[model samples]
Target chain A: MIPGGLSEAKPATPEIQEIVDKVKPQLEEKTNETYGKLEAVQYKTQVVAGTNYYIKVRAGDNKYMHLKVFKSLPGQNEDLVLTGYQVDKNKDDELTGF
Target chain B: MIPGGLSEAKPATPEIQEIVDKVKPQLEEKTNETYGKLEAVQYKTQVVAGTNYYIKVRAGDNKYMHLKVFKSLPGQNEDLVLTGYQVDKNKDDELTGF
Candidate 1:
Protein backbone atom coordinates (compact mmCIF):
# COMPACT_ATOMS: atom_id res chain seq x y z
CA MET A 1 0.00 0.00 0.00
CA ILE A 2 1.27 3.49 -0.88
CA PRO A 3 1.32 5.79 2.08
CA GLY A 4 -1.09 8.77 1.97
CA GLY A 5 1.42 11.44 0.87
CA LEU A 6 4.16 9.59 -0.92
CA SER A 7 4.80 10.24 -4.60
CA GLU A 8 7.18 8.20 -6.79
CA ALA A 9 6.03 5.16 -4.86
CA LYS A 10 5.23 1.92 -6.65
CA PRO A 11 2.66 -0.65 -5.56
CA ALA A 12 4.54 -1.86 -2.46
CA THR A 13 2.74 -5.18 -2.06
CA PRO A 14 1.66 -8.09 -4.25
CA GLU A 15 -1.84 -7.96 -2.77
CA ILE A 16 -2.77 -4.95 -4.89
CA GLN A 17 -1.38 -6.33 -8.14
CA GLU A 18 -2.81 -9.79 -7.52
CA ILE A 19 -6.33 -8.60 -6.89
CA VAL A 20 -6.16 -6.34 -9.95
CA ASP A 21 -5.18 -9.21 -12.21
CA LYS A 22 -8.11 -11.23 -10.94
CA VAL A 23 -10.67 -8.51 -11.70
CA LYS A 24 -9.26 -7.17 -14.95
CA PRO A 25 -10.50 -9.87 -17.30
CA GLN A 26 -13.96 -10.05 -15.76
CA LEU A 27 -14.37 -6.34 -16.47
CA GLU A 28 -13.08 -6.80 -20.00
CA GLU A 29 -15.51 -9.64 -20.71
CA LYS A 30 -18.45 -7.66 -19.42
CA THR A 31 -17.51 -4.63 -21.53
CA ASN A 32 -16.83 -6.73 -24.63
CA GLU A 33 -20.45 -7.83 -24.85
CA THR A 34 -21.51 -4.20 -25.07
CA TYR A 35 -18.65 -2.14 -26.48
CA GLY A 36 -17.33 -5.05 -28.60
CA LYS A 37 -13.78 -4.72 -27.26
CA LEU A 38 -11.60 -3.91 -24.28
CA GLU A 39 -9.09 -1.10 -24.54
CA ALA A 40 -7.15 -0.73 -21.26
CA VAL A 41 -7.07 -0.92 -17.47
CA GLN A 42 -5.51 1.87 -15.41
CA TYR A 43 -4.83 1.83 -11.69
CA LYS A 44 -4.94 4.56 -9.06
CA THR A 45 -4.78 4.60 -5.27
CA GLN A 46 -7.37 5.76 -2.77
CA VAL A 47 -6.70 6.70 0.83
CA VAL A 48 -9.07 5.38 3.42
CA ALA A 49 -8.06 4.82 7.04
CA GLY A 50 -5.82 2.34 5.29
CA THR A 51 -4.81 2.57 1.65
CA ASN A 52 -7.44 1.48 -0.88
CA TYR A 53 -7.17 1.11 -4.62
CA TYR A 54 -9.34 1.17 -7.73
CA ILE A 55 -8.96 0.73 -11.46
CA LYS A 56 -10.60 2.44 -14.39
CA VAL A 57 -10.94 -0.10 -17.17
CA ARG A 58 -11.38 1.59 -20.49
CA ALA A 59 -13.54 -0.12 -23.11
CA GLY A 60 -13.15 2.55 -25.78
CA ASP A 61 -15.95 4.99 -26.69
CA ASN A 62 -15.20 6.91 -23.50
CA LYS A 63 -16.67 4.07 -21.45
CA TYR A 64 -15.00 2.77 -18.30
CA MET A 65 -15.56 0.33 -15.44
CA HIS A 66 -14.39 1.36 -11.98
CA LEU A 67 -13.45 -1.43 -9.60
CA LYS A 68 -12.72 -0.49 -6.00
CA VAL A 69 -10.33 -2.66 -3.98
CA PHE A 70 -9.85 -2.75 -0.24
CA LYS A 71 -8.10 -4.71 2.48
CA SER A 72 -10.18 -7.62 3.80
CA LEU A 73 -8.71 -6.98 7.22
CA PRO A 74 -6.43 -4.43 8.90
CA GLY A 75 -3.53 -6.75 9.76
CA GLN A 76 -0.64 -8.20 7.82
CA ASN A 77 -1.23 -11.03 5.29
CA GLU A 78 -4.75 -9.70 4.77
CA ASP A 79 -6.15 -10.17 1.29
CA LEU A 80 -6.72 -7.24 -0.99
CA VAL A 81 -10.31 -7.60 -2.21
CA LEU A 82 -12.71 -5.96 -4.61
CA THR A 83 -15.29 -3.98 -2.75
CA GLY A 84 -17.56 -3.12 -5.72
CA TYR A 85 -17.70 -1.94 -9.32
CA GLN A 86 -19.55 0.66 -11.35
CA VAL A 87 -19.52 1.62 -15.02
CA ASP A 88 -18.59 5.18 -16.00
CA LYS A 89 -18.21 7.53 -18.92
CA ASN A 90 -16.24 10.73 -19.41
CA LYS A 91 -18.81 12.85 -21.17
CA ASP A 92 -22.33 13.87 -20.28
CA ASP A 93 -24.25 12.24 -23.09
CA GLU A 94 -27.76 13.43 -23.58
CA LEU A 95 -30.74 11.11 -23.34
CA THR A 96 -31.82 10.55 -26.94
CA GLY A 97 -33.66 7.24 -26.74
CA PHE A 98 -37.26 7.90 -25.89
CA MET B 1 -38.12 19.18 -4.65
CA ILE B 2 -38.93 17.37 -1.38
CA PRO B 3 -37.30 20.14 0.66
CA GLY B 4 -34.83 17.58 2.02
CA GLY B 5 -37.20 16.25 4.67
CA LEU B 6 -40.77 15.65 3.59
CA SER B 7 -41.51 11.94 3.38
CA GLU B 8 -45.01 11.93 1.96
CA ALA B 9 -44.35 14.34 -0.88
CA LYS B 10 -44.96 13.32 -4.46
CA PRO B 11 -42.93 14.47 -7.45
CA ALA B 12 -44.24 18.04 -7.58
CA THR B 13 -43.27 18.84 -11.14
CA PRO B 14 -43.09 17.24 -14.56
CA GLU B 15 -39.36 17.89 -14.95
CA ILE B 16 -38.42 14.87 -12.84
CA GLN B 17 -40.63 12.41 -14.68
CA GLU B 18 -39.85 13.91 -18.07
CA ILE B 19 -36.11 13.52 -17.81
CA VAL B 20 -36.49 10.04 -16.37
CA ASP B 21 -38.76 8.89 -19.21
CA LYS B 22 -36.16 9.93 -21.73
CA VAL B 23 -33.21 8.17 -20.10
CA LYS B 24 -35.11 5.06 -19.01
CA PRO B 25 -35.17 3.27 -22.36
CA GLN B 26 -31.57 4.11 -23.25
CA LEU B 27 -30.43 2.35 -20.11
CA GLU B 28 -32.70 -0.59 -20.91
CA GLU B 29 -31.40 -0.92 -24.46
CA LYS B 30 -27.79 -0.89 -23.31
CA THR B 31 -28.45 -3.47 -20.60
CA ASN B 32 -30.46 -5.65 -23.00
CA GLU B 33 -27.36 -6.23 -25.09
CA THR B 34 -25.89 -8.02 -22.08
CA TYR B 35 -28.59 -9.09 -19.65
CA GLY B 36 -31.13 -9.96 -22.43
CA LYS B 37 -33.97 -7.99 -20.88
CA LEU B 38 -35.31 -4.78 -19.38
CA GLU B 39 -36.68 -4.94 -15.86
CA ALA B 40 -37.68 -1.81 -13.95
CA VAL B 41 -36.79 1.85 -13.36
CA GLN B 42 -37.09 3.20 -9.84
CA TYR B 43 -36.71 6.83 -8.77
CA LYS B 44 -35.54 8.65 -5.66
CA THR B 45 -34.76 12.24 -4.76
CA GLN B 46 -31.31 13.78 -4.26
CA VAL B 47 -30.44 17.16 -2.84
CA VAL B 48 -27.53 19.06 -4.23
CA ALA B 49 -27.44 22.87 -4.45
CA GLY B 50 -30.89 22.19 -5.79
CA THR B 51 -33.01 19.11 -5.64
CA ASN B 52 -31.72 16.43 -8.02
CA TYR B 53 -32.99 12.97 -8.93
CA TYR B 54 -31.73 9.58 -10.06
CA ILE B 55 -33.08 6.28 -11.33
CA LYS B 56 -31.89 2.80 -10.67
CA VAL B 57 -32.91 0.76 -13.70
CA ARG B 58 -33.02 -2.87 -12.69
CA ALA B 59 -31.96 -5.12 -15.55
CA GLY B 60 -32.58 -8.37 -13.68
CA ASP B 61 -29.77 -10.62 -12.38
CA ASN B 62 -29.08 -8.01 -9.70
CA LYS B 63 -27.67 -5.62 -12.30
CA TYR B 64 -28.71 -1.99 -12.44
CA MET B 65 -28.00 1.28 -14.27
CA HIS B 66 -27.86 4.42 -12.17
CA LEU B 67 -28.83 7.62 -14.00
CA LYS B 68 -28.45 10.96 -12.25
CA VAL B 69 -30.57 13.98 -13.19
CA PHE B 70 -30.11 17.61 -12.22
CA LYS B 71 -31.62 20.98 -12.89
CA SER B 72 -29.67 22.57 -15.70
CA LEU B 73 -29.99 25.78 -13.78
CA PRO B 74 -31.00 26.28 -10.18
CA GLY B 75 -33.90 28.60 -10.87
CA GLN B 76 -37.41 28.48 -12.22
CA ASN B 77 -38.11 27.25 -15.78
CA GLU B 78 -34.79 25.45 -15.86
CA ASP B 79 -34.68 22.13 -17.63
CA LEU B 80 -34.05 18.96 -15.74
CA VAL B 81 -31.14 17.24 -17.43
CA LEU B 82 -29.34 13.91 -17.28
CA THR B 83 -25.93 14.31 -15.65
CA GLY B 84 -24.41 10.86 -16.12
CA TYR B 85 -24.84 7.13 -15.58
CA GLN B 86 -23.02 4.15 -14.11
CA VAL B 87 -23.70 0.43 -13.86
CA ASP B 88 -24.05 -1.16 -10.44
CA LYS B 89 -24.84 -4.41 -8.69
CA ASN B 90 -26.28 -5.33 -5.31
CA LYS B 91 -23.50 -7.77 -4.46
CA ASP B 92 -19.73 -7.84 -4.51
CA ASP B 93 -19.18 -10.78 -6.85
CA GLU B 94 -15.73 -12.32 -6.99
CA LEU B 95 -13.60 -12.12 -10.13
CA THR B 96 -13.17 -15.61 -11.53
CA GLY B 97 -12.49 -14.83 -15.20
CA PHE B 98 -8.81 -14.29 -15.40
Candidate 2:
Protein backbone atom coordinates (compact mmCIF):
# COMPACT_ATOMS: atom_id res chain seq x y z
CA MET A 1 0.00 0.00 0.00
CA ILE A 2 1.00 3.66 -0.33
CA PRO A 3 3.01 4.84 2.66
CA GLY A 4 0.78 7.86 3.28
CA GLY A 5 -1.95 9.49 1.28
CA LEU A 6 -2.29 13.15 0.40
CA SER A 7 -5.56 15.09 -0.18
CA GLU A 8 -7.39 13.27 2.61
CA ALA A 9 -10.54 14.60 4.28
CA LYS A 10 -10.44 17.77 6.39
CA PRO A 11 -11.52 17.81 10.04
CA ALA A 12 -15.22 16.87 10.10
CA THR A 13 -16.43 17.87 13.56
CA PRO A 14 -16.29 21.13 15.54
CA GLU A 15 -14.08 19.47 18.13
CA ILE A 16 -11.57 18.37 15.52
CA GLN A 17 -11.77 21.68 13.64
CA GLU A 18 -11.13 23.55 16.86
CA ILE A 19 -8.15 21.32 17.52
CA VAL A 20 -6.62 22.01 14.09
CA ASP A 21 -7.22 25.71 14.54
CA LYS A 22 -5.38 25.76 17.86
CA VAL A 23 -2.38 23.61 16.94
CA LYS A 24 -1.89 24.45 13.25
CA PRO A 25 -0.11 27.75 13.83
CA GLN A 26 2.30 26.34 16.36
CA LEU A 27 2.88 23.27 14.22
CA GLU A 28 3.41 25.41 11.12
CA GLU A 29 6.13 27.44 12.78
CA LYS A 30 7.78 24.30 14.14
CA THR A 31 7.45 22.54 10.78
CA ASN A 32 9.14 25.40 8.97
CA GLU A 33 12.12 25.26 11.30
CA THR A 34 12.29 21.49 11.37
CA TYR A 35 10.81 19.90 8.25
CA GLY A 36 10.71 23.06 6.07
CA LYS A 37 7.05 23.95 5.30
CA LEU A 38 3.74 22.24 5.91
CA GLU A 39 2.55 20.25 2.92
CA ALA A 40 -0.64 18.47 3.99
CA VAL A 41 -2.73 17.72 7.08
CA GLN A 42 -4.78 14.57 7.65
CA TYR A 43 -7.14 13.58 10.47
CA LYS A 44 -6.37 10.18 11.90
CA THR A 45 -8.98 9.28 14.52
CA GLN A 46 -10.80 9.91 17.77
CA VAL A 47 -9.96 6.47 19.12
CA VAL A 48 -9.77 7.15 22.86
CA ALA A 49 -12.38 8.62 25.20
CA GLY A 50 -10.36 11.66 26.33
CA THR A 51 -8.32 12.12 23.17
CA ASN A 52 -10.27 13.50 20.23
CA TYR A 53 -7.79 13.98 17.43
CA TYR A 54 -4.75 12.23 16.03
CA ILE A 55 -3.48 14.26 13.09
CA LYS A 56 -0.62 13.55 10.73
CA VAL A 57 1.11 16.27 8.71
CA ARG A 58 3.51 15.82 5.86
CA ALA A 59 6.10 18.53 5.50
CA GLY A 60 9.29 19.34 3.63
CA ASP A 61 11.66 16.61 2.51
CA ASN A 62 9.00 13.95 2.99
CA LYS A 63 9.04 14.36 6.74
CA TYR A 64 5.95 13.22 8.69
CA MET A 65 4.74 14.85 11.90
CA HIS A 66 1.86 13.93 14.16
CA LEU A 67 -0.27 15.59 16.82
CA LYS A 68 -2.57 13.99 19.37
CA VAL A 69 -5.03 16.51 20.79
CA PHE A 70 -7.06 15.59 23.84
CA LYS A 71 -10.10 16.63 25.84
CA SER A 72 -9.69 16.28 29.62
CA LEU A 73 -13.16 14.72 29.97
CA PRO A 74 -15.98 13.35 27.85
CA GLY A 75 -17.75 16.65 27.13
CA GLN A 76 -15.53 19.13 28.93
CA ASN A 77 -15.31 22.70 27.69
CA GLU A 78 -11.59 22.90 28.17
CA ASP A 79 -9.46 24.00 25.23
CA LEU A 80 -8.45 21.01 23.11
CA VAL A 81 -4.88 20.63 24.26
CA LEU A 82 -1.85 19.05 22.68
CA THR A 83 -1.11 15.86 24.51
CA GLY A 84 1.36 14.51 21.96
CA TYR A 85 3.51 15.92 19.12
CA GLN A 86 6.25 14.28 17.09
CA VAL A 87 8.04 14.36 13.74
CA ASP A 88 9.62 11.38 12.05
CA LYS A 89 13.01 12.59 10.85
CA ASN A 90 13.55 9.39 8.92
CA LYS A 91 10.45 9.14 6.76
CA ASP A 92 12.35 7.34 4.07
CA ASP A 93 13.25 4.56 6.45
CA GLU A 94 10.63 1.84 6.59
CA LEU A 95 8.47 1.86 9.73
CA THR A 96 9.21 -1.31 11.62
CA GLY A 97 5.77 -1.58 13.24
CA PHE A 98 2.96 -2.45 10.89
CA MET B 1 0.00 9.52 28.10
CA ILE B 2 -0.45 5.81 28.81
CA PRO B 3 1.50 3.74 26.28
CA GLY B 4 -1.63 1.62 25.86
CA GLY B 5 -4.75 0.89 27.83
CA LEU B 6 -6.27 -2.51 28.55
CA SER B 7 -9.99 -3.34 28.97
CA GLU B 8 -10.73 -1.20 25.94
CA ALA B 9 -13.87 -1.62 23.83
CA LYS B 10 -14.17 -4.65 21.61
CA PRO B 11 -14.80 -4.53 17.85
CA ALA B 12 -17.86 -2.39 17.18
CA THR B 13 -18.65 -3.33 13.59
CA PRO B 14 -19.33 -6.62 11.83
CA GLU B 15 -16.42 -5.93 9.53
CA ILE B 16 -14.00 -5.49 12.39
CA GLN B 17 -15.45 -8.45 14.26
CA GLU B 18 -15.08 -10.59 11.15
CA ILE B 19 -11.48 -9.54 10.72
CA VAL B 20 -10.71 -10.25 14.34
CA ASP B 21 -12.26 -13.70 14.11
CA LYS B 22 -10.22 -14.54 11.02
CA VAL B 23 -6.91 -13.38 12.46
CA LYS B 24 -7.27 -13.75 16.21
CA PRO B 25 -6.54 -17.47 16.26
CA GLN B 26 -3.38 -17.10 14.19
CA LEU B 27 -2.34 -14.16 16.29
CA GLU B 28 -3.08 -16.11 19.43
CA GLU B 29 -0.94 -19.03 18.34
CA LYS B 30 1.85 -16.67 17.36
CA THR B 31 1.55 -14.77 20.60
CA ASN B 32 1.62 -17.92 22.72
CA GLU B 33 4.88 -19.11 21.17
CA THR B 34 6.48 -15.70 20.85
CA TYR B 35 5.25 -13.67 23.78
CA GLY B 36 3.44 -16.24 26.02
CA LYS B 37 -0.29 -15.45 26.44
CA LEU B 38 -2.67 -12.93 24.97
CA GLU B 39 -3.41 -10.03 27.26
CA ALA B 40 -5.43 -7.40 25.38
CA VAL B 41 -6.74 -6.33 21.99
CA GLN B 42 -7.30 -2.74 20.94
CA TYR B 43 -8.65 -1.21 17.73
CA LYS B 44 -6.54 1.58 16.35
CA THR B 45 -8.23 3.26 13.34
CA GLN B 46 -9.44 2.97 9.79
CA VAL B 47 -6.92 5.46 8.44
CA VAL B 48 -7.01 4.51 4.78
CA ALA B 49 -9.50 3.42 2.15
CA GLY B 50 -8.74 -0.28 1.90
CA THR B 51 -7.53 -0.98 5.42
CA ASN B 52 -10.33 -1.67 7.89
CA TYR B 53 -8.53 -2.68 11.09
CA TYR B 54 -5.35 -1.89 12.97
CA ILE B 55 -5.54 -4.07 16.05
CA LYS B 56 -2.87 -4.08 18.71
CA VAL B 57 -2.49 -7.02 21.05
CA ARG B 58 -0.58 -7.04 24.30
CA ALA B 59 0.97 -10.41 25.02
CA GLY B 60 3.39 -11.92 27.54
CA ASP B 61 6.40 -10.01 28.80
CA ASN B 62 4.58 -6.82 27.79
CA LYS B 63 5.29 -7.53 24.11
CA TYR B 64 2.91 -5.75 21.78
CA MET B 65 1.71 -7.27 18.51
CA HIS B 66 -0.28 -5.70 15.69
CA LEU B 67 -2.39 -6.82 12.75
CA LYS B 68 -3.65 -4.66 9.91
CA VAL B 69 -6.61 -6.19 8.13
CA PHE B 70 -7.83 -4.91 4.78
CA LYS B 71 -10.71 -4.92 2.33
CA SER B 72 -10.11 -5.00 -1.43
CA LEU B 73 -12.73 -2.31 -2.12
CA PRO B 74 -15.60 -0.27 -0.76
CA GLY B 75 -18.62 -2.24 0.48
CA GLN B 76 -17.52 -5.31 -1.41
CA ASN B 77 -18.03 -8.85 -0.21
CA GLU B 78 -14.51 -9.94 0.51
CA ASP B 79 -12.86 -11.67 3.40
CA LEU B 80 -10.83 -9.26 5.44
CA VAL B 81 -7.30 -10.53 4.95
CA LEU B 82 -4.21 -9.74 6.95
CA THR B 83 -2.11 -7.16 5.19
CA GLY B 84 0.31 -6.61 8.01
CA TYR B 85 1.44 -8.50 11.12
CA GLN B 86 4.12 -7.61 13.63
CA VAL B 87 5.20 -7.82 17.25
CA ASP B 88 7.29 -5.27 19.07
CA LYS B 89 9.89 -7.14 21.09
CA ASN B 90 10.96 -4.00 22.84
CA LYS B 91 7.67 -2.89 24.34
CA ASP B 92 9.52 -1.32 27.27
CA ASP B 93 11.45 0.85 24.84
CA GLU B 94 9.60 4.06 24.06
CA LEU B 95 8.04 4.27 20.63
CA THR B 96 9.82 7.02 18.72
CA GLY B 97 6.76 8.14 16.70
CA PHE B 98 3.69 9.56 18.34
Candidate 3:
Protein backbone atom coordinates (compact mmCIF):
# COMPACT_ATOMS: atom_id res chain seq x y z
CA MET A 1 0.00 0.00 0.00
CA ILE A 2 1.20 3.48 -0.83
CA PRO A 3 1.31 6.21 1.82
CA GLY A 4 -0.63 9.15 0.46
CA GLY A 5 -0.12 7.87 -3.08
CA LEU A 6 -1.97 5.26 -5.08
CA SER A 7 -0.67 1.74 -5.37
CA GLU A 8 -0.49 0.09 -8.73
CA ALA A 9 -3.89 -1.16 -9.80
CA LYS A 10 -4.34 -4.87 -9.24
CA PRO A 11 -6.80 -7.39 -10.62
CA ALA A 12 -10.12 -8.16 -8.98
CA THR A 13 -9.52 -9.71 -5.57
CA PRO A 14 -11.72 -11.77 -3.30
CA GLU A 15 -10.83 -9.61 -0.33
CA ILE A 16 -12.05 -6.53 -2.12
CA GLN A 17 -15.00 -8.55 -3.35
CA GLU A 18 -15.95 -9.19 0.23
CA ILE A 19 -15.71 -5.51 1.02
CA VAL A 20 -18.04 -4.71 -1.85
CA ASP A 21 -20.38 -7.49 -0.87
CA LYS A 22 -20.61 -6.30 2.70
CA VAL A 23 -21.54 -2.82 1.64
CA LYS A 24 -23.62 -3.64 -1.43
CA PRO A 25 -26.80 -2.32 0.08
CA GLN A 26 -25.28 1.02 1.00
CA LEU A 27 -23.74 1.36 -2.44
CA GLU A 28 -26.96 0.60 -4.21
CA GLU A 29 -28.83 3.00 -2.00
CA LYS A 30 -26.36 5.78 -2.65
CA THR A 31 -26.49 5.32 -6.40
CA ASN A 32 -30.14 4.38 -6.69
CA GLU A 33 -29.07 1.41 -8.83
CA THR A 34 -29.28 -2.19 -7.77
CA TYR A 35 -26.25 -4.32 -8.41
CA GLY A 36 -27.04 -7.72 -9.85
CA LYS A 37 -23.77 -9.39 -8.83
CA LEU A 38 -21.59 -6.57 -7.71
CA GLU A 39 -17.92 -7.48 -7.71
CA ALA A 40 -14.62 -5.69 -7.64
CA VAL A 41 -12.92 -5.78 -11.02
CA GLN A 42 -9.78 -3.84 -10.01
CA TYR A 43 -8.34 -1.93 -7.08
CA LYS A 44 -5.69 0.47 -5.83
CA THR A 45 -4.94 1.24 -2.22
CA GLN A 46 -3.52 4.02 -0.07
CA VAL A 47 -2.20 3.34 3.40
CA VAL A 48 -3.01 5.74 6.18
CA ALA A 49 -4.35 5.00 9.66
CA GLY A 50 -6.36 2.63 7.54
CA THR A 51 -6.23 1.45 3.98
CA ASN A 52 -8.32 3.38 1.49
CA TYR A 53 -9.31 1.35 -1.55
CA TYR A 54 -10.37 2.68 -4.91
CA ILE A 55 -12.19 -0.14 -6.59
CA LYS A 56 -13.80 -0.60 -9.97
CA VAL A 57 -16.93 -2.66 -9.88
CA ARG A 58 -19.26 -4.45 -12.29
CA ALA A 59 -22.70 -3.29 -11.29
CA GLY A 60 -26.24 -3.62 -12.65
CA ASP A 61 -27.51 -2.11 -15.93
CA ASN A 62 -24.48 -3.55 -17.72
CA LYS A 63 -22.52 -0.54 -16.52
CA TYR A 64 -19.33 -0.12 -14.50
CA MET A 65 -18.78 1.92 -11.35
CA HIS A 66 -15.92 2.91 -9.07
CA LEU A 67 -16.11 2.81 -5.30
CA LYS A 68 -13.95 4.22 -2.56
CA VAL A 69 -14.00 2.05 0.53
CA PHE A 70 -11.88 2.35 3.65
CA LYS A 71 -10.83 -0.34 6.07
CA SER A 72 -9.61 0.88 9.39
CA LEU A 73 -6.37 -0.56 10.61
CA PRO A 74 -6.63 -3.75 12.54
CA GLY A 75 -7.45 -3.30 16.25
CA GLN A 76 -9.62 -0.31 15.49
CA ASN A 77 -12.49 -2.70 14.77
CA GLU A 78 -13.84 -0.22 12.34
CA ASP A 79 -16.11 -1.40 9.57
CA LEU A 80 -15.36 -1.02 5.90
CA VAL A 81 -17.01 2.18 4.84
CA LEU A 82 -18.01 3.46 1.42
CA THR A 83 -16.43 6.88 1.35
CA GLY A 84 -17.25 7.92 -2.22
CA TYR A 85 -18.20 6.64 -5.67
CA GLN A 86 -18.43 7.45 -9.36
CA VAL A 87 -21.08 6.04 -11.69
CA ASP A 88 -20.98 5.09 -15.36
CA LYS A 89 -17.22 4.84 -15.47
CA ASN A 90 -15.66 3.34 -18.58
CA LYS A 91 -13.96 -0.03 -18.39
CA ASP A 92 -10.67 1.43 -19.60
CA ASP A 93 -10.60 4.14 -16.95
CA GLU A 94 -7.73 4.23 -14.49
CA LEU A 95 -8.38 3.52 -10.85
CA THR A 96 -5.63 5.83 -9.79
CA GLY A 97 -5.27 9.63 -10.63
CA PHE A 98 -8.61 9.70 -8.84
CA MET B 1 2.51 -5.65 -25.86
CA ILE B 2 5.91 -7.19 -25.44
CA PRO B 3 7.83 -8.93 -28.16
CA GLY B 4 8.17 -12.08 -26.04
CA GLY B 5 7.32 -11.08 -22.48
CA LEU B 6 3.95 -10.58 -20.85
CA SER B 7 2.57 -7.10 -20.57
CA GLU B 8 1.91 -5.65 -17.15
CA ALA B 9 -1.42 -6.71 -15.71
CA LYS B 10 -4.11 -4.09 -16.17
CA PRO B 11 -7.69 -3.82 -14.98
CA ALA B 12 -10.20 -5.70 -17.13
CA THR B 13 -11.15 -4.13 -20.42
CA PRO B 14 -14.16 -4.56 -22.70
CA GLU B 15 -11.88 -5.79 -25.49
CA ILE B 16 -10.59 -8.56 -23.29
CA GLN B 17 -14.13 -9.16 -22.10
CA GLU B 18 -15.17 -9.66 -25.70
CA ILE B 19 -12.39 -12.15 -26.15
CA VAL B 20 -13.45 -14.05 -23.06
CA ASP B 21 -17.07 -13.99 -24.22
CA LYS B 22 -16.15 -15.41 -27.63
CA VAL B 23 -14.05 -18.22 -26.22
CA LYS B 24 -16.12 -18.97 -23.14
CA PRO B 25 -17.68 -22.11 -24.55
CA GLN B 26 -14.33 -23.50 -25.62
CA LEU B 27 -12.98 -22.86 -22.17
CA GLU B 28 -16.03 -24.57 -20.61
CA GLU B 29 -15.73 -27.60 -22.88
CA LYS B 30 -12.14 -28.12 -21.85
CA THR B 31 -12.82 -27.52 -18.16
CA ASN B 32 -16.39 -28.88 -18.09
CA GLU B 33 -17.59 -25.79 -16.21
CA THR B 34 -20.48 -23.87 -17.66
CA TYR B 35 -19.98 -20.17 -17.02
CA GLY B 36 -23.03 -18.26 -15.88
CA LYS B 37 -21.67 -14.83 -16.76
CA LEU B 38 -18.05 -15.14 -17.71
CA GLU B 39 -16.20 -11.87 -17.46
CA ALA B 40 -12.56 -10.90 -17.81
CA VAL B 41 -11.18 -9.48 -14.58
CA GLN B 42 -7.56 -8.87 -15.44
CA TYR B 43 -5.15 -9.46 -18.30
CA LYS B 44 -1.75 -9.26 -19.93
CA THR B 45 -0.86 -9.44 -23.60
CA GLN B 46 2.12 -10.60 -25.63
CA VAL B 47 2.84 -9.10 -29.02
CA VAL B 48 3.26 -11.78 -31.63
CA ALA B 49 2.01 -12.22 -35.16
CA GLY B 50 -1.23 -11.02 -33.70
CA THR B 51 -1.65 -11.01 -29.93
CA ASN B 52 -1.71 -13.54 -27.15
CA TYR B 53 -3.81 -12.79 -24.08
CA TYR B 54 -3.33 -14.14 -20.59
CA ILE B 55 -6.55 -13.39 -18.78
CA LYS B 56 -8.06 -14.14 -15.40
CA VAL B 57 -11.80 -14.66 -15.44
CA ARG B 58 -14.72 -14.89 -13.04
CA ALA B 59 -16.17 -18.12 -14.34
CA GLY B 60 -18.83 -20.54 -13.18
CA ASP B 61 -18.89 -22.03 -9.70
CA ASN B 62 -18.13 -18.57 -8.38
CA LYS B 63 -14.46 -19.34 -8.89
CA TYR B 64 -11.68 -17.79 -10.91
CA MET B 65 -9.80 -19.22 -13.92
CA HIS B 66 -6.96 -18.14 -16.12
CA LEU B 67 -7.07 -18.49 -19.88
CA LYS B 68 -4.47 -18.21 -22.59
CA VAL B 69 -5.93 -17.21 -25.90
CA PHE B 70 -4.37 -16.42 -29.25
CA LYS B 71 -5.76 -14.22 -31.95
CA SER B 72 -4.65 -14.30 -35.56
CA LEU B 73 -3.59 -11.14 -37.32
CA PRO B 74 -6.48 -9.25 -38.87
CA GLY B 75 -5.59 -10.54 -42.32
CA GLN B 76 -5.37 -14.14 -41.12
CA ASN B 77 -9.17 -14.18 -40.61
CA GLU B 78 -8.75 -17.00 -38.13
CA ASP B 79 -10.83 -17.00 -34.99
CA LEU B 80 -9.61 -16.38 -31.48
CA VAL B 81 -8.88 -19.74 -29.86
CA LEU B 82 -8.49 -20.83 -26.28
CA THR B 83 -5.07 -22.40 -26.31
CA GLY B 84 -4.86 -23.23 -22.62
CA TYR B 85 -6.36 -22.55 -19.18
CA GLN B 86 -5.83 -23.17 -15.47
CA VAL B 87 -9.04 -23.83 -13.60
CA ASP B 88 -9.68 -23.18 -9.93
CA LYS B 89 -7.04 -20.50 -9.80
CA ASN B 90 -7.17 -18.17 -6.83
CA LYS B 91 -8.08 -14.54 -7.33
CA ASP B 92 -4.52 -13.43 -6.61
CA ASP B 93 -2.96 -15.56 -9.31
CA GLU B 94 -0.70 -13.57 -11.58
CA LEU B 95 -1.54 -13.16 -15.23
CA THR B 96 2.00 -12.04 -16.08
CA GLY B 97 3.63 -14.91 -14.18
CA PHE B 98 1.35 -17.32 -16.01
The segments of candidate 3 whose C-alpha lies over 4 angstroms from its true place after superposition are A1-49, A75-78, B1-98
For all predictions, the C-alpha RMSD in Å is 26.6, 26.1, 26.5
iRMS values in order, in angstroms?
25.5, 25.1, 24.7
lDDT of 3 by residue, A1-98 (tens): 11133345556767445444544555445446544555444444322222454555443245554444444553543354444444445567554523
Q: Compose the digit string of candidate 1's lDDT tens values, residues B1-98.
A: 12222112232234323333333344335556332221222212222223343333322333533333344454443364444333444213211110
Candidate 2 Cα lDDT to native: 0.34
Model 2: residues >4 Å from true position, as ranges? A1-98, B1-48, B73-78, B90-98
- For every prediction, compared with the true complex, DockQ reads 0.02, 0.02, 0.02
Question: lDDT: which candidate is best?
Answer: 3
Q: Write the per-residue lDDT of candidate 2 for residues B1-98, one digit (tens) a residue.
A: 23222223232334333333333344335435322222222223223222343333333343443333444554543454544433443333322212
Between the candidate structures 1 and 3, which one is better when assessed by TM-score?
A: 3
Root-mean-square deviation of Cα positions for candidate 2 versus the true structure, in angstroms: 26.1
Off by over 4 Å in 1: A1-48, A72-78, A91-98, B1-98
Pairs with backbone N, CA or C atoms under 3 Å apart (clashes), candidate 3:
none
Report the C-alpha lDDT of model 3 over B1-98, residue by residue, as the tens digit. 11223345557676445544444444445545454544445444322223444444443445554544454554442354545444545567765524
Please give, for residues A1-42, the per-residue lDDT of candidate 2 as tens digits: 223322233424343333334333443354352222222222
